[PDB]
């Protein structure tokens, strides 16, 4: 209904890899159509990621354009969930003016490794039933909290009094006090302020009374990536650079110190490593220096699972004059497994068009489905996908309910594909610049 930040994108129909318990892909599940071998391989790679025991495993998704490489990557991301980090970058993102390409690749790798910290905290949680603060003009005070099970009266220190005054704690507030540091958080009110007070123009909903003991031993889980730790420890004001991205080349000594203390935190009970995935789409934009760094970088124990995609065949490696498969050096190709995607058939294309129509909420006739499948096979899958939306708009303009063949023919005539546009460009080539 309401227009959210996230709208219907090119992969909004992808919900996962669509596999069973035996990692045997279904024909049409979780938005996936076809690509049985590629999806089975993606499932095996996802299991390898979730086991987390093996570091620096690289998988390259290679196939023709429009065969579903980014779709498979997004399916892996969806089936991985938010708990496990999944950093997706374009290969052109590493070329930065703020840092070297190798620093960018390090930050991308370290962003794909979560550190799940655990700590125990003493938490007081209850309804303020009475608060008294007396000050000269040291401060003294008395606070009583209730939690249905008990009612305890507390004698307040000066620092707790200052915190309570700053938070403006009033009776009828459901508050939380962290005994480790005195931070005071208000969960909500339990009943209205006095009606006799003017202004105070609010009738907010009242949260239910806490239950159990007032003070509990609560375990809390905080997850940070290695890159966040690095940036925080890089300088006194490092945390500001986590958002602005003004991170220079972080000293390698700091990174070694962090790797060592993280190893200690995992030998102790303080933290757990959550190794994730770095997905470098269009990896052929990387140059020889970046591939050469990736060679050594995957040999680190803190390296994540690297997924790559490219449609280039035997092409020239950027920054060199040598041609290699996928635009990747043979030294890195040796360090990875290649997964190949196959071109779709009529049935797979029709099912993809159906799923895209369902996600775009476009009702379309079966004859329209047939003509659009023929167009997609002739021209491209993405072109037919975009004609879905254009034909929906043209049908709604005419006050129609179902996209018919006339709408598809209309939008086909209105919007050209690469081939017809190229033919018309050649027919008028003298009008274009530099022939």
């Amino acid at each position: 209904d309401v227009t959210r930040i996230e709208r219907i994108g090119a992969h909004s129909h992808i919900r996962g890899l669509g596999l069973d318990d035996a990692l045997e892909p279904r024909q049409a599940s979780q938005g996936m159509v076809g690509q049985l071998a590629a999806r089975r391989a993606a499932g095996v790679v996802l299991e390898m990621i979730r086991e987390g025991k093996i570091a620096g495993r690289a998988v390259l998704i290679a196939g023709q354009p429009g065969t579903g490489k980014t779709a498979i990557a997004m399916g892996m991301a969806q089936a991985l969930g938010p708990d496990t980090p999944f950093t997706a970058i374009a290969g052109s993102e590493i070329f930065s003016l703020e840092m070297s390409k190798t620093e960018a690749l390090t930050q991308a790798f370290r962003r794909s490794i979560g550190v799940r910290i655990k700590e125990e905290t003493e938490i007081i949680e209850g309804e303020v039933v009475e608060i008294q603060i007396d000050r000269p003009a040291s401060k003294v005070g008395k606070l009583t909290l209730k939690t249905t099970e008990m009612e305890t009266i507390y004698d307040l220190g000066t620092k707790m009094i200052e915190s309570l005054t700053k938070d403006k704690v009033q009776a009828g507030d459901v508050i939380t006090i962290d005994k480790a540091t005195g931070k005071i958080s208000k969960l909500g009110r339990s009943f209205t302020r006095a009606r006799d007070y003017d202004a105070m123009g609010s009738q907010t909903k009242f949260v239910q009374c806490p239950d159990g003991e007032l003070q509990k031993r609560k375990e809390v889980v905080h997850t940070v990536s290695l890159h966040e730790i690095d940036v925080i420890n890089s300088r006194t004001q490092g945390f500001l650079a986590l958002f602005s991205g003004d991170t220079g080349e972080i000293k390698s000594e700091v990174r070694e110190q962090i790797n060592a203390k993280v190893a200690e935190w995992r030998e102790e009970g303080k933290a757990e490593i959550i190794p994730g995935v770095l997905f470098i789409d269009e990896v052929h934009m990387l140059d020889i220096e970046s591939f050469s760094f990736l060679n050594r970088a995957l040999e680190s124990d803190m390296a994540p699972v690297l997924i790559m995609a490219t449609n280039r065949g035997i092409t020239r490696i950027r920054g060199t004059s040598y041609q290699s498969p996928h635009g990747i050096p043979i030294d890195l190709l040796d360090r990875l497994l290649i997964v190949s995607t196959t071109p779709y058939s009529e049935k797979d294309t029709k099912q993809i068009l159906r799923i895209r129509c369902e996600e775009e909420d476009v009702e379309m006739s079966e004859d329209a489905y047939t003509v659009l499948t023929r167009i997609g096979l002739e021209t491209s899958l993405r072109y037919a996908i975009q004609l879905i939306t254009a034909a929906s708009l043209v049908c709604r303009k005419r006050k129609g309910t179902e996209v018919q063949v006339d709408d598809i023919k209309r939008v086909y005539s209105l919007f050209l594909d690469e081939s017809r546009s190229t033919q018309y460009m050649k027919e008028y080539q003298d009008a274009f610049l530099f022939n």
Partner: protein, 58 residues
Amino acid sequence: NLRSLETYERLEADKKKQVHKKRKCPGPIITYHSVTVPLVGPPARCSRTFITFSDDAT
């Protein structure tokens, strides 16, 4: 004898009255106070604030 024995056994009353005093050191004091009070036309309740000043000068 009980008063004599209380020289050893009066651990409770004396400590409670010495610790949980209802007054503080001399001088001007401003007491912020906030209590639950029942609404009038668990039960319906509202929160009300009182401010108390020690002396007329302040």
